[PDB]
A paper describes a structure:
Single-particle cryo-EM structures were determined for M8a-31 Fab bound to SARS-CoV-2 WA1 and to Omicron BA.1 spike trimers at resolutions of 2.9 and 3.1 Å, respectively. Despite 15 substitutions in the Omicron BA. RBD compared with the WA1 RBD, the M8a-31 epitopes and binding poses in both structures were similar (root mean square deviation [RMSD] of 1.0 Å calculated using 1,267 resolved Cα atoms in each Fab-spike protomer). M8a-31 Fab binding to SARS-CoV-2 WA1 and Omicron BA. For spike trimers complexed with M8a-31 Fab, distances between the C termini of adjacent CH1 domains were measured as 52 and 49 Å for M8a-31 Fab bound to the WA1 and Omicron BA.1 spikes, respectively, suggestive of potential intra-spike crosslinking.
Here, we identified monoclonal antibodies (mAbs) capable of cross-reactive binding and neutralization of animal sarbecoviruses and SARS-CoV-2 variants by screening single mouse B cells secreting IgGs that bind two or more sarbecovirus RBDs. To deduce recognition and neutralization mechanisms, we used single-particle cryo-EM to solve structures of Fabs from the seven cross-reactive mAbs complexed with a SARS-CoV-2 6P spike trimer. Structural analyses revealed neutralization mechanisms, potentials for intra-spike trimer cross-linking by IgGs, and induced changes in trimer upon Fab binding.
Numbering used by the authors:
A (entry chain A): 291 to 620, 636 to 676
B (entry chain H): 1 to 9, 11 to 30, 35 to 59, 62 to 72, 74 to 109, 114 to 128
C (entry chain L): 1 to 57, 65 to 72, 74 to 80, 83 to 109, 114 to 126
D (entry chain B): 26 to 71, 74 to 178, 187 to 290
E (entry chain B): 826 to 827, 854 to 873
Amino acid sequence: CALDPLSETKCTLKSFTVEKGIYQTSNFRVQPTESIVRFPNITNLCPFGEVFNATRFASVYAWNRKRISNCVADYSVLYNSASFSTFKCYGVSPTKLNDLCFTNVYADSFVIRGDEVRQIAPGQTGKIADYNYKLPDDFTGCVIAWNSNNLDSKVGGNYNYLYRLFRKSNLKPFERDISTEIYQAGSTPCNGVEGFNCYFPLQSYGFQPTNGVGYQPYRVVVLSFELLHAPATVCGPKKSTNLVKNKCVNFNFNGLTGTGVLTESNKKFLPFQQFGRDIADTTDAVRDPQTLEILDITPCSFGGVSVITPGTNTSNQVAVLYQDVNCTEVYSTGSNVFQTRAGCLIGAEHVNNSYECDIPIGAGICASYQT
Amino acid sequence: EVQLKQSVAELVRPGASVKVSCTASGFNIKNIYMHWVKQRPEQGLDWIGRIDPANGNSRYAPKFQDKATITADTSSNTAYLQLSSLTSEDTAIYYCADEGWGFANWGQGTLVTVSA
Amino acid sequence: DIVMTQSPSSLTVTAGEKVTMSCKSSQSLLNSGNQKNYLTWYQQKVGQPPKLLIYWASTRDPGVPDRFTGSGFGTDFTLTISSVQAEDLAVYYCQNDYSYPLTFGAGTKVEL
Amino acid sequence: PAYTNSFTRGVYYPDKVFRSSVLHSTQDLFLPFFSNVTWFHAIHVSNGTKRFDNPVLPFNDGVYFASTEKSNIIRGWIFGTTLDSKTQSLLIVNNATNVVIKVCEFQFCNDPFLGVYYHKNNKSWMESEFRVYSSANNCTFEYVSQPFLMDKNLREFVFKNIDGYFKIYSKHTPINLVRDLPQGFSALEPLVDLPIGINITRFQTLLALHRSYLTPGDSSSGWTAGAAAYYVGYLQPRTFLLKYNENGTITDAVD
Amino acid sequence: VTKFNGLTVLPPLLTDEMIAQY
Ligand SMILES: *[C@@H]1O[C@H](CO)[C@@H](O)[C@H](O)[C@H]1NC(C)=O
Ligand SMILES: *[C@@H]1O[C@H](CO)[C@@H](O)[C@H](O)[C@H]1NC(C)=O
Ligand SMILES: *[C@@H]1O[C@H](CO)[C@@H](O)[C@H](O)[C@H]1NC(C)=O
Ligand SMILES: *[C@@H]1O[C@H](CO)[C@@H](O)[C@H](O)[C@H]1NC(C)=O
Ligand SMILES: *[C@@H]1O[C@H](CO)[C@@H](O)[C@H](O)[C@H]1NC(C)=O
Ligand SMILES: *[C@@H]1O[C@H](CO)[C@@H](O)[C@H](O)[C@H]1NC(C)=O
Ligand SMILES: *[C@@H]1O[C@H](CO)[C@@H](O)[C@H](O)[C@H]1NC(C)=O
Ligand SMILES: *[C@@H]1O[C@H](CO)[C@@H](O)[C@H](O)[C@H]1NC(C)=O
């Protein structure tokens, strides 16, 4: 059956001799060449860069907490930047930051010297982490630390940055204490007056250009991730492929997930309108999320394959009709390909002179076996 | 903190299949594409392969290709490692990973041994 | 596939004395953008799985962080320790990460 | 309270689908044809004595808000289950340069409002201060977009809550009538389908108040809010047959 | 006088010009 079209016709008829006529053997079908995915532009970008580019970071005890959402978080720039020294992530893979997203993101910024960077970590205690900024053990997020000795240190000594060293109890995770009150380390009440038993809990760091490793200032930023039952408004960038037209492809225009060939269309949509439907409630045209154009979606070409042959007694030659298929896309093609309304004929030679119909093809065209 | 509690070691027979499950606490597998690693005793440690929760498309080391197949469960906070054609060399300790810059969190250590 | 060898893989020191070990890495592990090498050190005792001693070839992991700083452009790496203690009596593994097929090193035994 | 007939008003584009020359029948929350929309009169000014009438209207399935004020006296809306700090409340305030849509656990006073004062030299009515919520807790949403309540002309809005989506539709058409909705059709284009998962059970409208209104005197002789009038209709589950033209707009509908 | 789910409309053999010629 698979040897040649006449043998397929013989198998379909289950007869070794087939009479003159046109017989439908199989069904032509165009499989999708590729898959195209286009999601809208990343118009809203989460301003993590301006947090990283801030001239003066927040104090370690008074760490700035910002909730960011309704945007797109791009972590590719963070990976590309080589300034970061410690990029330890707890509870989440740094690679999957773009792939997976949360409902809300919280970011904290502070400046600390080199040797105290390691103290700011979940499940770790330190002289500064207990009384300035604490992270819970089960917390999921990333810690970003980079050297900023040139910016945050000078020859005279940069005392602008301040840290807390004394408190009655350690600060709770994600809780900031900004109290500047005098600490009552001794039994004698301070009453707001510095004394032998009273030392000011807040201190200003001393920075020099030649501090060395472990003592130079470091700008450390910690970001938080958590999930809520509310709909998520912030997520990472989505993959967008180049647009292809006049080719049978698989399109996913934000959930169409359909198969068809995309062509330019003259139909005009309302500004809020994206989809398009015909009478039968089938997708007909979809607007490209990137640009502003209407791409009519007619689906892949398909039809029945009909073998046009005379009687096997008369001769052994066939012509193939691919019904309702423009055979710019497809006996093998390239042999006397002639196009008509019902399809195009492979293996038949068109003649301008007209005779009476012998094998009805369709739309007035008839095949015949003639010299 | 974060810990990886993989399944306790169990006896296996040659020519059979063994599934090893690694559990995690403090997070979910959905953002973690955990690696799998085996430590051959009295020999340099070697890497088995990598998997992903969604679209796993697992890639293994060339020595373990078509031999160690590992699947990732979307839910239940677990991932399953499957082995076949276990021999005497296959008797080694296995660990989990957190695919950080290095393998951040390793399993407690399962000692798979095949014998009669 | 990168062949990773650690030297000398066995060496003895007195307590609180510097150690000189290095594992040579081929393929010149380097990444665009970030100049930090994608080779991570490890510290493995007898009984529990290895833990990150150094990642990015220069980053002190929290916990017993007595130096471990490594200087290397990719062709060579160093994990000298100034003073060795009970927690330092272990085997150190250096592993490549830039190449997707990664192979761990043989390891080096150090004892007080 | 007063009542008026909403002949064909309130029909909105049910979805973002485009259809041309298609009579599409959709079952959706709609304002029934020829129903009563309660014509509430917000402020009655005589003396300038204030007669405040801003009830907590039941949101129910939806609200077809409509106003004909040309002085922008109607300025904002209030949405909340109980309108206190205990429950999350949706808040919309409109101002000159921009708008703010803030969804927090606002503690609402008796008469929340927007304050605006006049500069003699600048000759502009810039807003003095925002006095609507006493408290702002759990501020998850801060959506901001171009002002719609900007410039006699009938203004219509539809508010509906489904699956955690708060949908706003709008249309602005000039009408000669003052106390009656026009006997004509105008489809309501979607404005913002902002995502908020809170539940809304009661509804209120904010009224713009000038500095003369906020004078220490009890009577607001300086500024008059008598022009304030906001129609309200309630959406019900209905089957509608929408008529689309070749542009894709809804020319007419049948209930 | 005034769909690709397997639905095809075969063209009539006798075209309208041809039927008009008859
Ligand atoms: C701001 O910080 C980012 C870190 O993500 C860095 O890539 C960028 O170069 C910084 N901007 C400037 C102007 O240095
Ligand atoms: C979408 O982004 C691309 C790349 O920046 C840009 O060329 C295109 O103009 C954007 N689309 C619109 C509608 O601006
Ligand atoms: C083949 O058979 C048909 C009908 O059976 C007949 O009309 C035709 O002449 C035959 N051809 C030959 C070459 O005999
Ligand atoms: C077939 O496609 C070609 C492509 O250029 C076009 O010119 C021709 O008109 C098409 N024919 C039919 C019948 O659609
Ligand atoms: C048929 O006629 C057309 C146009 O008159 C011409 O292009 C074509 O070559 C002709 N073919 C034959 C076989 O005469
Ligand atoms: C509207 O209310 C009036 C009374 O104000 C009543 O007579 C009329 O029947 C009502 N119409 C509808 C549709 O309920
Ligand atoms: C108007 O509202 C916007 C919305 O956030 C606000 O940013 C702006 O400051 C307001 N301007 C005045 C004058 O009230
Ligand atoms: C609407 O359709 C008419 C013709 O039906 C056309 O003239 C007009 O440009 C289209 N658009 C608008 C906004 O009227």
